[model samples]
Target chain A: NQTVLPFDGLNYPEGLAVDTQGAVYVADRGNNRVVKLAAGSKTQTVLPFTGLNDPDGVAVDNSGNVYVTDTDNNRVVKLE
Target chain B: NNQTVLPFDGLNYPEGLAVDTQGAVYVADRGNNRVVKLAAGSKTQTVLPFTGLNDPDGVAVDNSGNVYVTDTDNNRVVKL
Candidate 1:
């Protein structure tokens, strides 16, 4: 429902969530950022990772928001 | 959090990761045939005593810490 931040590319993508629109949101661990593939498109968008560090799993709420387990940061951040 | 979270010992390809409002993390240790919990505050650990799991893969949690999981091999959603 909204736009997020700068993607610097990533690695070790361990977990992901496929939303209702078939959009894939991923947790890229090595470079430490969240990313997405717009459904069937090859293009990718890297969301902002202001406070994220060593994140693992990425989730989507039914209410329309993003959640990531910022593993190294020892916390889960909800992107609002 | 640091990097000590995901590469956890005694766990294999954890299929699920869910964090409740209390800061507790529930992991479906898929390859280990069980589930583990990193309790609130992220300082203690425990394995849930509940049974009825068979290769659980996906997980979701609520505000009250209620959990719902996908038992892949079992073909069902097991609540915990």
Candidate 2:
């Protein structure tokens, strides 16, 4: 059975994706950004900006490039 | 009068997107209750309506070309 993991310190984490190496990427929706948390590292911001406007989802491609769903912006963006 | 419009309109609550190996973009048209495939130019194709989706919110494509969609309001995942 899948269970919800307790947040170490995330503020309204929404979208989730696991890289091939198992690294987790989360769209901190309330913060309007994405975050990458390594298997053992503490929480940290990978992408940040209020311009995202309630970024609700995120996805990563095979090349490790990140794609974020800018909800209020009404478009998807590829991160550099 | 055949000029292509930038930032295509008809999305109507576009929620999630998945890119295939060939770069084809698929978007979950939530409010419209269908999946849209964008190939090139302004052409688009709808993929589903019989899936009985209630507000599809997320999408993912597997290696075998299988598509997975999260039906948010229904609280279930549908494989297409």
Candidate 3:
């Protein structure tokens, strides 16, 4: 069922993950940041942080922390 | 000020992360066509010996002790 969820802010997204609480973290590659879509919410927000360069992966840990892979930067960073 | 040698040089065209333990992480290295493990504070990564996987896209493990991976070109999910 590859249906679109319909929240925007994604461009060339590569990887995405959801947490237990249902929050979604998406790798907005073109935007160069991780976009978070709160569970059941219709709006996406940028993580309010920097140092992202062509981010291509996103995962949310159990404690609400997020992880991202900066492809161009060749680094994986953890955000609390 | 945080530059380190690549623990797993076999990483390329990767997308997605799966974090279970606090100090360990799982990754789907697409271009490399495999999953790899990374230590939070270490410089060595263990490239999981999985075969028949193609262009992996996501990874996850949990208390249930199963590592689930979804690959794009493979069009299947593997549990290990």
Candidate 4:
């Protein structure tokens, strides 16, 4: 089934990624942070990982670790 | 401690990233105007079939192994 994720208050959400648990993550570029919408949840939460500058892309592994491309910062960070 | 470098080189302004079930990584090489795949345990990247794209941004891979990309400059989404 195709599902539409919420798009409210997202400033230039540039990249998206999903974990094995179906949790969705977004790189909220303008907000300079990454957010997560848990599996079967309507609300999105701002991830605690910080110091992001124009975050652009996101990726997740099967183990549920997160990788974020901090675009303007010119580096990628991984969260275990 | 030993440090090893991955084979991802020559990428310009790369944006989106996705990991398939097999652990292969897909990258939207935005500045290169193309997408490339790094297979599990492979060193080099295999460029996918795409042309005439300007700043392709987002990329995703479905469970069925089909790849999807957001051709931003072209204002369209492409499935491969």
Index of the highest-TM-score prediction: 4
lDDT of 3 at B56: 73
Weakest ten-residue segment in model 3 chain A by summed lDDT:
A1-10
Q: In candidate 3, which residue ranges exceed 4 Å CA deviation?
A: B1-80
lDDT of 4 by residue, B1-80 (tens): 99956588799998788888898889889999999999988988998876666677887886767675656555444556
What Cα-based lDDT does every candidate model obtain? 0.65, 0.63, 0.69, 0.75
lDDT of 3 by residue, B11-74 (tens): 7976767777575788888888889988787677887766777777777664643565655464
Which sections of candidate 1 miss by over 4 Å?
A: A1-10, B1-13, B17-80
Off by over 4 Å in 4: A1-3, B1-56, B62-80
Question: In terms of lDDT, which candidate is strongest?
Answer: 4
Docking class of 3: incorrect
CAPRI category for model 1? incorrect
Cα displacement (angstroms), candidate 4, residue B24, comes to: 11
What residue runs in model 2 are displaced by over 4 Å at the alpha carbon? A1-55, A58-80, B1-9, B40-42
Residue B44, candidate 3: C-alpha displacement in angstroms: 33
Task: Looking at model 2 chain B, report the run of 10 residues with the lowest lDDT sum.
Answer: B70-79
Indicate the residue-level lDDT of B53 in model 4.
62
How well does candidate 3 score on lDDT at residue A41?
76
Question: What is the descending lDDT order?
Answer: 4, 3, 1, 2
Each prediction's number of clashing residue pairs = 1, 0, 0, 0
In candidate 4, residue A5 scores what lDDT?
54
Q: Report the TM-score of chain B alone for all candidates.
A: 0.78, 0.77, 0.80, 0.90
- Rank by DockQ, descending? 4, 3, 2, 1
